[PDB]
Curated annotation (Swiss-Prot):
The lineage of its organism: Bacteria, Bacillati, Bacillota, Bacilli, Lactobacillales. The modification 4-aspartylphosphate is found at D8. Catalyzes the interconversion of D-glucose 1-phosphate (G1P) and D-glucose 6-phosphate (G6P), forming beta-D-glucose 1,6-(bis)phosphate (beta-G16P) as an intermediate. The beta-phosphoglucomutase (Beta-PGM) acts on the beta-C(1) anomer of G1P. Glucose or lactose are used in preference to maltose, which is only utilized after glucose or lactose has been exhausted. It plays a key role in the regulation of the flow of carbohydrate intermediates in glycolysis and the formation of the sugar nucleotide UDP-glucose. This is Beta-phosphoglucomutase. Autophosphorylated. It comes from Lactococcus lactis subsp. lactis (strain IL1403).
Amino acid sequence: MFKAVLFDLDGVITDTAEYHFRAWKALAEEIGINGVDRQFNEQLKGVSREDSLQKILDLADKKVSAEEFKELAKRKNDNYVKMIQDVSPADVYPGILQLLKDLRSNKIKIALASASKNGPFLLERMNLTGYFDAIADPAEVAASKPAPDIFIAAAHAVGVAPSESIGLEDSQAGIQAIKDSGALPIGVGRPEDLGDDIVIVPDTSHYTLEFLKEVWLQ
Ligand SMILES: [Mg+2]
């Protein structure tokens, strides 16, 4: 049986999509760029901060120096961090808390493998820190998803090989990263984004210990 489960944060444990959206909107409003509405924000989901900022500047063909770019990116982040002060246990996705409890009572290691620079803060706000055996520090890994580095680091941090682990993710790049780490992916979402070759559940309420055991056996 698997010895560890490696969790991404966003799209598995929770999301902060409304807060990122409000941050970018607020920034666009500040600088007088029209177009940054909910529909447009779909093009920013899971995209890097710098790429998201450039997409917004492009709406107005707007040209900016390195330092100005840096400052607008900082401004959006400051926005975002202020807004996530309201994250709470109610932000935990369906099924995850019970999964965590069951994993822990069966002595299965639990690790975070998230690019989020606010991972530990977010886990504290959701009251989930006591379940985590480790949090892979995204600042200490050479390469980001779909590179496997973060999943390797996470499994190693809890004393296991990735081949002993299940990885849970909602993105194609995450699922690839899990695959190449040597852990077993189980995706949440749809095959059109994630691929046909891995097990997928429609939502996180399907992530149960019983189900992860059935996948591992199979
Ligand atoms: Mg994710």
